[PDB]
XYZ file of C-alpha atoms in Angstrom:
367
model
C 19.823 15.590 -1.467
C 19.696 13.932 2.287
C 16.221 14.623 4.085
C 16.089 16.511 6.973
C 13.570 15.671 9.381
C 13.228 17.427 12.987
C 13.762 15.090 16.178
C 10.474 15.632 18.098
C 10.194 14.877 21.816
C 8.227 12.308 24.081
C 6.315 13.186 27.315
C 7.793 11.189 30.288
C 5.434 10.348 33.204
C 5.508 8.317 36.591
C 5.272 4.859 37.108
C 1.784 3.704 37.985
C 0.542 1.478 40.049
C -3.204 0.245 38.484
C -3.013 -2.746 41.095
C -2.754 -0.727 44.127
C -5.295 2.274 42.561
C -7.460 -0.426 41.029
C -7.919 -2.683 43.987
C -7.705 0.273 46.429
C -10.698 1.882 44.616
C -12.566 -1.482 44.975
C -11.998 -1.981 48.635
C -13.512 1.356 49.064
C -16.521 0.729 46.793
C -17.066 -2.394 48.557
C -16.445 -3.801 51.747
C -13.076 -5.543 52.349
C -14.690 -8.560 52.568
C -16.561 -7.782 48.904
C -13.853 -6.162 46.748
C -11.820 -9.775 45.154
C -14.680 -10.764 43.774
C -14.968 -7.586 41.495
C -11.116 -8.058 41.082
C -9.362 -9.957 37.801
C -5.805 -9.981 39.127
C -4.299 -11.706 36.214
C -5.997 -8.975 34.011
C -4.892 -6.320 36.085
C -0.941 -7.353 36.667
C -0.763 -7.219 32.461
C -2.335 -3.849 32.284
C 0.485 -2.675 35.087
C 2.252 -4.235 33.023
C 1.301 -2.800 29.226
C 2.011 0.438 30.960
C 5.186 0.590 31.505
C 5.992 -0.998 28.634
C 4.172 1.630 26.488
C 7.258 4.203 28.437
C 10.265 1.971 28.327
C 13.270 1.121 26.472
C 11.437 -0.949 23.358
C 12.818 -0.656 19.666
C 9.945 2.277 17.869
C 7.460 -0.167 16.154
C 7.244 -1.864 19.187
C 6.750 0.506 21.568
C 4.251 1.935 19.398
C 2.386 -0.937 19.373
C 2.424 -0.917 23.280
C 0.631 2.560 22.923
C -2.013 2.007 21.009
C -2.811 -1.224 22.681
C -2.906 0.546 25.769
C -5.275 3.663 24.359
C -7.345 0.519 23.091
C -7.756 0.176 26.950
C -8.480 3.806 27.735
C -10.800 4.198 24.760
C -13.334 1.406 26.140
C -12.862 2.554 29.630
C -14.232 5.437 28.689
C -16.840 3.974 26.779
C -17.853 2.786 29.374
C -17.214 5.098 32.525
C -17.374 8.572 30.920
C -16.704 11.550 32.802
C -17.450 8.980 35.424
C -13.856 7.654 35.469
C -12.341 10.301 37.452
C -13.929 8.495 40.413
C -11.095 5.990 39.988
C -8.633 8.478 41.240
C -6.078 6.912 39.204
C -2.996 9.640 39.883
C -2.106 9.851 36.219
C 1.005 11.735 36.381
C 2.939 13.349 33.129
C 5.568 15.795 32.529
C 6.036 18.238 29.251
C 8.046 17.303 26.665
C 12.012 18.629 27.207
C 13.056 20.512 24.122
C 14.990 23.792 25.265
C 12.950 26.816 25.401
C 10.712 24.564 27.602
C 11.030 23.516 31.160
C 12.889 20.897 32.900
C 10.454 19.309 35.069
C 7.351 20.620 34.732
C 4.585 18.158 35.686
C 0.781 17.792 36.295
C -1.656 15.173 37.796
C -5.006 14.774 36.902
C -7.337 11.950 37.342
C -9.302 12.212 33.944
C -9.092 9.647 31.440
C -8.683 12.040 28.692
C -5.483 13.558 30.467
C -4.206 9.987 29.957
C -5.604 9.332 26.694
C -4.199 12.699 25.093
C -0.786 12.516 26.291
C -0.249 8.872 24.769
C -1.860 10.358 22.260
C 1.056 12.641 22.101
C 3.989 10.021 22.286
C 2.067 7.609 19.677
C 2.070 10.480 16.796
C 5.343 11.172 17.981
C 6.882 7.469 17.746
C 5.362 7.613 14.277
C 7.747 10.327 13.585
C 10.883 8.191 14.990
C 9.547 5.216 12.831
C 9.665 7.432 10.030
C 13.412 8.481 10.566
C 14.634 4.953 11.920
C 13.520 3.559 8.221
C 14.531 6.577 6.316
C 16.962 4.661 4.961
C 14.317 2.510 2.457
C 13.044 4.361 -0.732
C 10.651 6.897 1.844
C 7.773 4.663 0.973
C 7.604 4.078 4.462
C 8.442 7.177 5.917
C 6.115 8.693 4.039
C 3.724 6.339 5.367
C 4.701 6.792 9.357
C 4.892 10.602 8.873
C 1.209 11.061 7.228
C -0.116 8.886 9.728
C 1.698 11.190 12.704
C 0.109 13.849 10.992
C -3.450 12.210 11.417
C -2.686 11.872 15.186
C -1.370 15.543 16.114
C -4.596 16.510 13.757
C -7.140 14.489 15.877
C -5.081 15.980 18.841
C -6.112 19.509 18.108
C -9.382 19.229 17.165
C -10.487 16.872 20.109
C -8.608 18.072 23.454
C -9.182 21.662 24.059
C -8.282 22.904 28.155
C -5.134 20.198 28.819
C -3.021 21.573 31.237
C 0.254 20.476 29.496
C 1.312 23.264 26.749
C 2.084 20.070 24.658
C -1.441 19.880 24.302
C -2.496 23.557 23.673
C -4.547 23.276 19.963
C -2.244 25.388 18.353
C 0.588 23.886 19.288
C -0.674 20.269 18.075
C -1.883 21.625 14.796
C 1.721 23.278 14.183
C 3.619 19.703 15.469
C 0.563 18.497 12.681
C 1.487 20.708 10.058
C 5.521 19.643 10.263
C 4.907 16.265 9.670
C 2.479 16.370 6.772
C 5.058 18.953 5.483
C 7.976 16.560 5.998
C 5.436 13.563 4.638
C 5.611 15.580 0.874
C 8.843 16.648 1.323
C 9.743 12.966 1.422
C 7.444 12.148 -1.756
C 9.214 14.862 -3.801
C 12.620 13.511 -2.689
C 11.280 9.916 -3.700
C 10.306 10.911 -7.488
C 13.552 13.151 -7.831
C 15.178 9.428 -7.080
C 12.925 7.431 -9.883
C 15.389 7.911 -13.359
C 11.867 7.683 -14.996
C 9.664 10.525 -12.700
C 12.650 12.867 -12.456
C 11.974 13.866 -16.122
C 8.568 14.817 -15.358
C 9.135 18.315 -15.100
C 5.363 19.494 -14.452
C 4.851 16.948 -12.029
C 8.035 17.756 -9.859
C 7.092 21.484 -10.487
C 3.655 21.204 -9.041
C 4.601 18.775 -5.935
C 7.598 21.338 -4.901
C 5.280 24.058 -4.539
C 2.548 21.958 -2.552
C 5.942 21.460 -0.108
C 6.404 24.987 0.145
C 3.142 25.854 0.883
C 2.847 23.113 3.716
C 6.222 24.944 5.290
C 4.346 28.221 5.034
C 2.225 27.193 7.643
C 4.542 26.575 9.815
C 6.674 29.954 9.014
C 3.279 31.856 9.442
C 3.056 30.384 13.163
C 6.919 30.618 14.205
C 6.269 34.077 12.367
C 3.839 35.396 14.925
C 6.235 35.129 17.486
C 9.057 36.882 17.431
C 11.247 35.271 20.480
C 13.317 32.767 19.708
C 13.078 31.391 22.970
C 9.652 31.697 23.263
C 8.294 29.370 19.860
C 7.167 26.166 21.331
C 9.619 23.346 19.843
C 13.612 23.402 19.110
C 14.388 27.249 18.298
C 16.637 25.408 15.487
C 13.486 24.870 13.503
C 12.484 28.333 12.450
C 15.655 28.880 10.722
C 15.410 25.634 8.560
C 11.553 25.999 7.922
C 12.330 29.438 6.259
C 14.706 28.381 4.384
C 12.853 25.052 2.964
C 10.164 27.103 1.760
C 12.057 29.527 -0.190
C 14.127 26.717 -1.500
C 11.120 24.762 -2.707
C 9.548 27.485 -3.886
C 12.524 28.487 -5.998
C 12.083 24.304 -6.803
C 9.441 25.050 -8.311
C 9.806 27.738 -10.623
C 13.274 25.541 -11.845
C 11.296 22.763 -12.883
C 8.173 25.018 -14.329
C 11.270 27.059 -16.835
C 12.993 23.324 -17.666
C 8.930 22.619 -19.011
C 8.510 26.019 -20.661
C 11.702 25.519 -22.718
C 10.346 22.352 -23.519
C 7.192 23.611 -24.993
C 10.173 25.818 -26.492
C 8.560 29.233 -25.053
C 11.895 30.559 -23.660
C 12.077 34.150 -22.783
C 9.084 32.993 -20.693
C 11.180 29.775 -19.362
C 14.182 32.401 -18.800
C 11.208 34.377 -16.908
C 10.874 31.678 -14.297
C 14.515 30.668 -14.195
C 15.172 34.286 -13.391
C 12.109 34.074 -10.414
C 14.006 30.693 -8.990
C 17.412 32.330 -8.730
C 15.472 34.946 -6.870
C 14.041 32.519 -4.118
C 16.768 31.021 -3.829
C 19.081 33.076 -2.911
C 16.539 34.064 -0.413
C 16.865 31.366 0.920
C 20.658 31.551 1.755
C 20.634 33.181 4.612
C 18.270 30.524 6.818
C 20.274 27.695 5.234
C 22.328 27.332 8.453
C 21.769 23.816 9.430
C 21.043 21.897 5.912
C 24.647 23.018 4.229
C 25.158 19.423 4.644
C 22.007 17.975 3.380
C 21.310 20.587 0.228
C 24.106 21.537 -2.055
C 23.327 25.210 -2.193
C 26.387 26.056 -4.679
C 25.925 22.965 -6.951
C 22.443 23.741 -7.650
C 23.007 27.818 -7.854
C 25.211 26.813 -10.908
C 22.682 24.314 -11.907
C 20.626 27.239 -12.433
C 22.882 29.750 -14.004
C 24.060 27.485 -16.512
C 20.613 26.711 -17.908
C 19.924 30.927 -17.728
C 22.836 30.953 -19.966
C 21.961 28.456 -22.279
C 18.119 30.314 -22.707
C 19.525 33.716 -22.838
C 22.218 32.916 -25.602
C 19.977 31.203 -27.986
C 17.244 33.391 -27.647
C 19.137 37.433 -28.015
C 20.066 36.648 -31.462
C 17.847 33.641 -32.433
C 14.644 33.451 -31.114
C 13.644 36.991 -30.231
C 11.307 36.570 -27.300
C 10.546 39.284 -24.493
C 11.103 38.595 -21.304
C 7.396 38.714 -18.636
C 8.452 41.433 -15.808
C 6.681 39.347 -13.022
C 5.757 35.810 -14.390
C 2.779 34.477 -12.735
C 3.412 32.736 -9.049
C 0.000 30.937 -9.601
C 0.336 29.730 -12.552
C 2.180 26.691 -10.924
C -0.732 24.499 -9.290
C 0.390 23.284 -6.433
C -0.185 19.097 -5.629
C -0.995 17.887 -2.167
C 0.041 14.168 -2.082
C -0.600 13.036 0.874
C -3.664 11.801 2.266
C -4.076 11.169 6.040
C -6.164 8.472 7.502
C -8.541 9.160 10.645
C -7.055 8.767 13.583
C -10.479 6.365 14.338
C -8.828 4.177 11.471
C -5.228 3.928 12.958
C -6.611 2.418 15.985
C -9.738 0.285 15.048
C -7.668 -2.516 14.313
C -6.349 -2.758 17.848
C -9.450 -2.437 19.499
C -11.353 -6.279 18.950
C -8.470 -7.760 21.037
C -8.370 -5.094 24.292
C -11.805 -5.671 24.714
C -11.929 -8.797 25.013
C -9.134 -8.981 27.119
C -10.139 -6.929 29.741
C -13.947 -7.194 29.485
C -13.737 -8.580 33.297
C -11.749 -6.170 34.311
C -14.232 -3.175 33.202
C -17.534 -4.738 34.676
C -15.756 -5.178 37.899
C -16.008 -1.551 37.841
C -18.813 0.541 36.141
């Protein structure tokens, strides 16, 4: 099976100019004949500088790194200004991300730090994400690793920034953009084991970890679900389609690997119970299956299936007599969250020793 992971989008924004709203500020604070002395110019061209280079054309890692050194900056400018550092006037100008359903140039300025600090925010948890799929191509260790820590950042995203004007940054919307990639993050891990010669046997294990995978994509399905307009759910309207269908097709996952156990413990007719329940989900998942023909083979693992009912039902109607349970019992497959996300506090401490010390001057010139 190839991994499918959705492409999410950056927020653009316009070129600013901290030495021209940094110094300007100053020679309105003080006189004109006052203001270089509360200037550090050599500080103040690299942060112009960090900037833009935090919204260029860098390879991922690096221009994630560029972000989070420059949130380093707006974390201990707030620190230290507060609410206060609207007084900067620093026109911090960003548009919303360009998916489809979504405008085409759609823009707000606001002169809040946390208006700049959430919308890096944004593109940092998203960069994680094109980490993630730019290394896809290792054995998902490190996927896994980039998409559980985008999930920490949309997370953090939610809970903290609450009246942004940018729909990007709506709660709901984060928490759902949060929910996709720690959905994706134990996709990935269930992939990874399928791939180990030794793990792949593990039948309880894989049976436990697919249906932690379909509940995460239930989530999601639940908030697509309580809109109805296509052209109204917040991302790429392809994703609804491909959500449904990995949930059903987990689920059914699942209830494979569960049967392949019960056989083991040689309770068939209970085994052909849960073979009969996976067949069931998924070929309800068929009809959503749209864009992954090409990264699940939906036929191959329908006969997959049938075979092994055959086997069960064959050597069990005249040699081990065993009724058949009507409904089996959906939770009697406990589901395994393995994925563990890191504060978002954590991602970023290690950046923060070296931005304060670097611009230390910079900030007393202004409090």
């Amino acid at each position: 099976m190839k991994p499918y992971l959705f492409d999410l989008k950056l927020k653009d924004t316009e070129k600013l100019d901290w030495k021209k709203g940094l110094s300007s500020y100053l020679k309105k604070s003080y006189g004109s004949s006052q203001w270089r002395t509360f200037y550090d110019e050599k500080a103040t061209s690299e942060l112009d500088h960090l900037r833009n280079n935090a919204n260029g054309e860098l390879a991922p890692s690096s221009l994630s790194e560029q972000n989070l050194k420059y949130y380093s900056f707006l974390e201990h400018l707030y620190f230290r200004l507060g609410s206060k550092g609207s007084r900067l006037k620093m026109d911090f100008t960003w548009y919303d991300a360009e998916y489809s359903s979504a405008q085409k140039g759609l823009k707000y300025t606001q002169h809040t730090l946390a208006f700049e600090k959430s919308c890096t925010l944004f593109n940092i948890a998203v960069i994680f994400t094109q980490i993630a799929r730019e290394n896809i191509n290792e054995d998902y260790k490190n996927s896994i690793a980039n998409l559980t820590k985008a999930f920490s950042c949309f997370e953090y995203l939610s809970e903290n920034f609450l009246n942004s004007p940018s729909v990007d940054l709506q709660s709901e919307n984060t928490r759902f953009l949060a929910n996709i990639c720690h959905a994706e993050a134990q996709e990935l891990f269930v992939l990874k084991l399928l791939n180990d010669q030794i793990s792949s046997k593990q039948y309880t294990l894989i049976s436990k970890l697919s249906r932690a995978t379909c509940n995460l994509f239930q989530k999601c399905h639940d908030f697509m679900k309580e809109i109805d307009d296509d052209v109204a759910i917040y991302g790429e309207p392809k994703w609804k389609t491909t959500v449904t269908c990995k949930l059903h097709f987990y689920k059914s996952l699942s209830a494979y690997y569960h049967g392949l156990h019960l056989e083991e413990e040689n309770r068939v007719g209970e085994a052909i119970a849960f073979l009969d329940f996976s067949m069931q989900q998924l070929i309800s998942s068929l009809p959503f299956k749209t864009w992954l023909v090409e990264f699940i083979d939906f036929d191959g693992f329908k006969e997959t299936l049938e075979k092994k009912q055959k086997e069960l039902i064959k050597d069990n109607d005249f040699i081990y007599h065993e009724s058949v349970p009507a409904v089996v019992q959906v939770d009697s497959i406990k589901a395994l969250d393995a994925i563990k996300s890191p504060t978002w506090e954590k991602i970023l401490e290690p950046y923060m020793q070296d931005v304060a010390n670097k611009y230390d001057s910079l900030y007393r010139g202004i409090i």
